[PDB]
């Protein structure tokens, strides 16, 4: 399938014999599913997100079918706000990010998909993140008015400054839209801008 990013990339998965809905998430190292019974043995782990750390149950070598594509790998079970398929399984199903329908660069998911952006006349490194609704950039003194906002993910919520109509060049591709500024651990390019550069998930 080729999946565009105007809506959250939610797909049905099969796991432990049950169906679940989950987000294909290039900005996640790992796969995190809401509390559930998983046949398997587990061990405690902590993982981090936009707003801090949570405790999860780590299950290894779990079969998961993602839109009909098979994977067998680590699945973390815990208090995530949305079920997420991260790179550990996206790589197993041969998922890549592609610009402009595949006419542009292809980015594999073996490592975090970090690319150079230009914003406010400044160059920064940011993660191309299909699991982000918004674009979140580390503290940077952007000019212009703004409005306070809170955005969530693993760990809860952080406060950010919302700036609209900010030009952002991504790997040489021009975009313009809302940028949220605040204490994110990693700079994130989310769907609001990935759609403007024609980025798709492909597998």
């Amino acid at each position: 399938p080729q999946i565009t990013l105007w809506k959250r990339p939610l797909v049905t998965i099969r796991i432990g014999g049950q169906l679940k809905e989950a987000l294909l998430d290039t900005g996640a190292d790992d796969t995190v599913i809401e509390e559930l019974n998983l046949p398997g043995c587990w061990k405690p782990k902590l993982i981090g997100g936009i707003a801090g750390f949570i405790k999860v149950r780590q299950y290894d070598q779990i079969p998961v079918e993602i839109a009909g594509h098979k994977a067998i790998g680590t699945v973390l079970v815990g208090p995530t706000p949305v079920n997420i398929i991260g790179r550990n399984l996206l790589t197993q199903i041969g998922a890549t990010l592609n610009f402009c329908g595949g006419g542009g660069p292809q980015i594999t998911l073996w490592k975090r998909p970090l690319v150079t952006i230009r914003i406010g006349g400044q160059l920064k490194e940011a993660l191309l993140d299909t699991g982000a609704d918004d674009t979140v950039i580390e503290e940077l003194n952007l000019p212009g008015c703004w409005k306070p906002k809170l955005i969530g993910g693993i760990x809860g919520f952080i406060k950010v400054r919302q700036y609209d109509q900010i030009p952002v060049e991504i790997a040489g591709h021009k975009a313009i839209g809302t940028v949220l500024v605040g204490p994110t651990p990693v700079n994130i390019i989310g769907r609001n801008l990935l759609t403007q550069i024609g980025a798709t998930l492909n597998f």
Binding site: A28, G48, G86, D133, G152, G153
Partner: peptide, 6 residues
């Protein structure tokens, strides 16, 4: 493990 915004 770092894992991404809603």
């Amino acid at each position: 493990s770092l894992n991404x915004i809603x």
